[PDB]
Amino acid sequence: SKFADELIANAAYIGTPGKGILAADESTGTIGKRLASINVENVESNRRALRELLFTTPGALPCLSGVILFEETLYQKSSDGTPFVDMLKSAGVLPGIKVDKGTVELAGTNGETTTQGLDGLGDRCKKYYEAGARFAKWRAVLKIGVNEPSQLAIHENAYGLARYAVICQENGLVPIVEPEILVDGSHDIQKCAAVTERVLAACYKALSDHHVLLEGTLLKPNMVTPGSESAKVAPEVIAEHTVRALQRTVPAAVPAIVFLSGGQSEEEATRNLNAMNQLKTKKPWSLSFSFGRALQQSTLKTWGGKEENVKKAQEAFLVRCKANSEATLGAYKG
Amino acid sequence: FTSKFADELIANAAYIGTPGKGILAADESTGTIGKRLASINVENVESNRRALRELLFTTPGALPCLSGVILFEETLYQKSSDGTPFVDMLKSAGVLPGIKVDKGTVELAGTNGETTTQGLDGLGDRCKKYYEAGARFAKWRAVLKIGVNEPSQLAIHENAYGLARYAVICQENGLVPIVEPEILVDGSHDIQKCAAVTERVLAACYKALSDHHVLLEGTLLKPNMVTPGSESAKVAPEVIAEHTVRALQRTVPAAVPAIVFLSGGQSEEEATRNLNAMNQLKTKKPWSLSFSFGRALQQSTLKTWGGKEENVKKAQEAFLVRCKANSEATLGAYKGD
Amino acid sequence: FTSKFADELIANAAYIGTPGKGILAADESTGTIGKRLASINVENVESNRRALRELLFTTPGALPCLSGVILFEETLYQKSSDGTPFVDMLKSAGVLPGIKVDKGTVELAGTNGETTTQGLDGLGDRCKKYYEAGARFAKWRAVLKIGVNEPSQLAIHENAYGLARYAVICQENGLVPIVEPEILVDGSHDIQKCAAVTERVLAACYKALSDHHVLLEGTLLKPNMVTPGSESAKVAPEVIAEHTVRALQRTVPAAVPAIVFLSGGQSEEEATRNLNAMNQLKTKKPWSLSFSFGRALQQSTLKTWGGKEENVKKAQEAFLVRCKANSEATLGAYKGD
Amino acid sequence: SKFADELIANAAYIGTPGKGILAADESTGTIGKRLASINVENVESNRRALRELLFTTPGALPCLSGVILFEETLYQKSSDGTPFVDMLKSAGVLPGIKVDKGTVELAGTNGETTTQGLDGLGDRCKKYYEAGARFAKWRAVLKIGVNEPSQLAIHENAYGLARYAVICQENGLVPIVEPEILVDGSHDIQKCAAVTERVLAACYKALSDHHVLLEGTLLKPNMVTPGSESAKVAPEVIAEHTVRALQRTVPAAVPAIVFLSGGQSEEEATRNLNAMNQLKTKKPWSLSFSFGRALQQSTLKTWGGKEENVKKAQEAFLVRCKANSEATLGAYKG
Numbered sequence A, D: 001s002k003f004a005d006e007l008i009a010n011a012a013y014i015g016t017p018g019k020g021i022l023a024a025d026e027s028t029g030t031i032g033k034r035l036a037s038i039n040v041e042n043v044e045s046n047r048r049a050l051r052e053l054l055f056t057t058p059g060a061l062p063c064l065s066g067v068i069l070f071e072e073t074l075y076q077k078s079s080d081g082t083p084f085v086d087m088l089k090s091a092g093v094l095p096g097i098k099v100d101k102g103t104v105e106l107a108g109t110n111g112e113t114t115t116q117g118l119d120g121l122g123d124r125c126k127k128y129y130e131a132g133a134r135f136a137k138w139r140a141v142l143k144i145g146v147n148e149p150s151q152l153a154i155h156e157n158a159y160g161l162a163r164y165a166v167i168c169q170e171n172g173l174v175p176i177v178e179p180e181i182l183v184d185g186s187h188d189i190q191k192c193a194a195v196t197e198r199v200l201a202a203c204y205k206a207l208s209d210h211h212v213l214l215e216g217t218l219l220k221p222n223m224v225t226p227g228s229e230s231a232k233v234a235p236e237v238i239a240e241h242t243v244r245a246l247q248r249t250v251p252a253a254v255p256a257i258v259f260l261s262g263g264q265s266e267e268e269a270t271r272n273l274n275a276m277n278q279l280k281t282k283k284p285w286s287l288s289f290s291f292g293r294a295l296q297q298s299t300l301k302t303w304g305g306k307e308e309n310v311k312k313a314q315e316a317f318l319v320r321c322k323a324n325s326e327a328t329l330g331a332y333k334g
Numbered sequence B, C: 001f002t003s004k005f006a007d008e009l010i011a012n013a014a015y016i017g018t019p020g021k022g023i024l025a026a027d028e029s030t031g032t033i034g035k036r037l038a039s040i041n042v043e044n045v046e047s048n049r050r051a052l053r054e055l056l057f058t059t060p061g062a063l064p065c066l067s068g069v070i071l072f073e074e075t076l077y078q079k080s081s082d083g084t085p086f087v088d089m090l091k092s093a094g095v096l097p098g099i100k101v102d103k104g105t106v107e108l109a110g111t112n113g114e115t116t117t118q119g120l121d122g123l124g125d126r127c128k129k130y131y132e133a134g135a136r137f138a139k140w141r142a143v144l145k146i147g148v149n150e151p152s153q154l155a156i157h158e159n160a161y162g163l164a165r166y167a168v169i170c171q172e173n174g175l176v177p178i179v180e181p182e183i184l185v186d187g188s189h190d191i192q193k194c195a196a197v198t199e200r201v202l203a204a205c206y207k208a209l210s211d212h213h214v215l216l217e218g219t220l221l222k223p224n225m226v227t228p229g230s231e232s233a234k235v236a237p238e239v240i241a242e243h244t245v246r247a248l249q250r251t252v253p254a255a256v257p258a259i260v261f262l263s264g265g266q267s268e269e270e271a272t273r274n275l276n277a278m279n280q281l282k283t284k285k286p287w288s289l290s291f292s293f294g295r296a297l298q299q300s301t302l303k304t305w306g307g308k309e310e311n312v313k314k315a316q317e318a319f320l321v322r323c324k325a326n327s328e329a330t331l332g333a334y335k336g337d
């Protein structure tokens, strides 16, 4: 691309040790569910207030290399008139943009999906770049079952990610490739390992067929864990299976892997990331975080209303930011 | 994947291929029909777009030659001048309304101007709304070119799987999908090369359709005929027939009921003669060989029409000629003109 | 890829599918024919292997029912008791000699007992030597199973591409390749499942054959009929016919001249009745539907034969019955027995 | 496999810094061409003598983690009655075994090949393991042209390597996967980079579909170079394009990459390897050597006859061994 050098610089930067990505890219719908989750009306006034609370948290932006925004938020102003994107860039945080248009179910499968949003994506990306966005997000969802994920599901999601990745790079956004394997079910960690290995290898083959510049991409995978209905397992076990799965599939050329939290609690996500960064083994990428819920849940709770609870919630948000920052360095302690 | 429309998809796809009938492609965009409308000094206003299509559809004796008409979005909701909805006009004559659903092409990075086709986003809800509007089949055009290194494996793959996913969403919402992998004529290659490329592309298309669990008996194919490139010597209909049918024999399952050829670069008479010769070829052909012609059905009608509505009756005479000729061509019974 | 044998491959593959004829599969290994020879208390010596095959080939009135006989290596160079080379015996009656060329199956690591087929190494020189010996077609058996997660994508791929490479080497050396993706009956699945799996496998096979540039008009297909699993209720011939032919309609190009069904688990009468019903089904079938039967042609002949050569004439009577019945079956003209 | 742990240990060992692989696996035919190349009759007496000269070279076996043998040589004795395989194991060198049965041309391509040898390979491998072999070699050949390598050539060679790899591991031999892209032609280094990237990515996708244990494999690729008819280029340029190509395609899980020399002279091979080991960049595998001709050519010349020329040729063989050893550490100087 004409953006090759800037894609490569920004993707490397996202992976800076001690930093990760906040996912604040919840739709008007999803952020509603979260806003109701603590008895708050889903009005733009409140959507604005929640995101502003996060971004004006005293020690927080230094812990973040990136923030994923929803379209609305990319053009939104803080209360003092400052555009959020300026607020982010002042602190050295790259603004990112969710570009996928949700999932739809594949006929002839058992509730497996493919992700939409290729239509007019190049012109959207260009407009987002002009607005200050420098990376993009697109989520593919795959499930684990008797015959899942199917060859059709894998293929659709891999090549859908690969085509999205190309359009992103043509328009100056570093694509986060996010093939999330859902944790839901009763499978063991070994099964999650095999499936994760299969999916990533299909994804990197797809990315190669599409001539994607790997040094200008990011990966946002699931950690390798037992299913949501299976026994929890220690961080050192998650670490060992996750890192081995990535060693088997993700080229060195990729600069950074920013884990999604999935089912995990705030503390579990942090402890799991931390253990991966304590593992003495070849890891030719930054292992960092791209958390929404695992970074925000305690902050939403403390907040609820406003005023006295802003300062206490900003304290709570800083705790999680600083903990995950520590986790990227293998230096988190309880 | 059974669709809830399986029975109606199968019946309608079979119907399109009724011997003695074919498809009029009147689905050209606001842009393309402009180029055609300017081509005879006519301003591209919806009043004129409406008038051209009305002229075609109200041609006495024409609709009986047509199993289907592909419409552009605008035309699907358009009324004739007398207040008759075009879709009603079509259904009264037994013609199935169809709908172009693709959203154009875009270039693939890292290739030499090869394209992929857009339009999967929100296609299911569009298809459903089109079904409610009277449409019973759909069209999506993938474009492939012939070159030194073309079509590339990436171009083939993107277009095949894009067609396959489109085909599924169509069937889920009750539209028979026309699968249209057009290989463009541009270049200096011979007919043998066009044969090899067409064989490669169709085989990739039917593999993709299988991986997507598409009901083949509820689909249609709209391929290019096999021809020499645009810069090469034109060749007789018997030769086009022999290479085209052999290419289809090698790739298109019997389960597919009808193959409705696109005209592409061809003149009206050349298209008809080519189709006719395919239906005179004594060989296993487990599908109807018919037509889905835009240019090759409309060119002489646009010429005689020109502008004012006292050229209408002479142009409707000219449109009937081409309809009747192509009808004859589906039966191997066309006798020159 | 044009072979220097293209014309002869096309003629011979077409011939195999002559209405009223089919293939005897007498290509069972030294091991398998042992199991059959023990099955009636006969020592597996080459003298007896020779005697069984001689009995078949010298059956008065049998060879006219056969377009082809598949031979094992040993049998291709064997002489009858009167000094007549079997291959000459076959060619005098217009029967093409064929040759099994695969070297058995081996299990795939990381699967649940799925196999891939061996024999590509040195196959071209073997094929050439077999052609020189009088063979004009070849056989290679891939085995796929139906299970919870079977057949796996790896099993399909390995067997499809193994068939495709084999097919090419065959054609380069003048043998029409019989492509034989046998899906085994074992299990409790219903006929619908067998249909879906058979559709998947054949589509992968024809994709592989296309990628390898195989001349389809110079190939044959030897698939399983579509049936319920071995543990499920047997079903009427009309039902086998309808699911089998639909599966073939969805996958096998018209360019393929003949589909010669393997018998698999089926009894003699069941095989014949099943084939017969397929030829009574009024539908697009752009290939000969015929037979390539081993077990289903030989079982009752082995029984009446048993041992000593005064059971020969009664067994040759029994072999003629099955030959004539299957011949009738290719024409849809079998009338029970 | 039942050999998983030993495959992983031996593959890691081949990549020991300061060591590489001698390819002495020339057929009765090929070693003839080499033996005639210096006016020597191709008799077993002489075949025996040449290999013995190499293996009894004073400082040489310590420079080698592996020696690839032909079948004949695996059972051959030295002149003093010592089995070569014992001679190798005493010095800590793993015996390896060429298992492919040559190439054949693919119909409908322009002289592209596929490699034979899957038939009865498991029983061969088992017998070779029993004989002391602990790794295996199989060579796929791909060419660069207008339409080459073709999708058919890539596929056949990738999946042929993947199936060979599996059988090897089932029987305790670490498979060297060798997709050599021939240097022949007028293409530039950028073209060789693109083709090498395409081929390796197809190979690792094939290996994943076949469930190959990557930690128990080796890769033997071409270095990335301009074609044989193009201008030679400096080692630092070969290094930069080669390593980038490997970063884009070869998983970290693979322990070692042992380069084939291809067209290169003895000194050019060494200088090129050396430069790759001087490159400061993520390289999650050993970069070492698997040289036949680039290790042997000067030794064959000095030798010719025997006697006075043995000791001078052993001096010449030690020079090349020590130089390539230095090259694996980035410590070679002229």
Ligand code: PRO
Residues within 6 Å of the ligand: A023, A259, A260, A261, A262, A263, A290, A291, A292, A293, A294
């Ligand atoms: O897996 C994740 O990271 C998503 C983001 C929003 C909450 N959970």
Ligand code: PRO
Residues within 6 Å of the ligand: D023, D259, D260, D261, D262, D263, D290, D291, D292, D293, D294
């Ligand atoms: O590329 C190589 O390493 C081969 C081995 C023998 C000489 N040349």
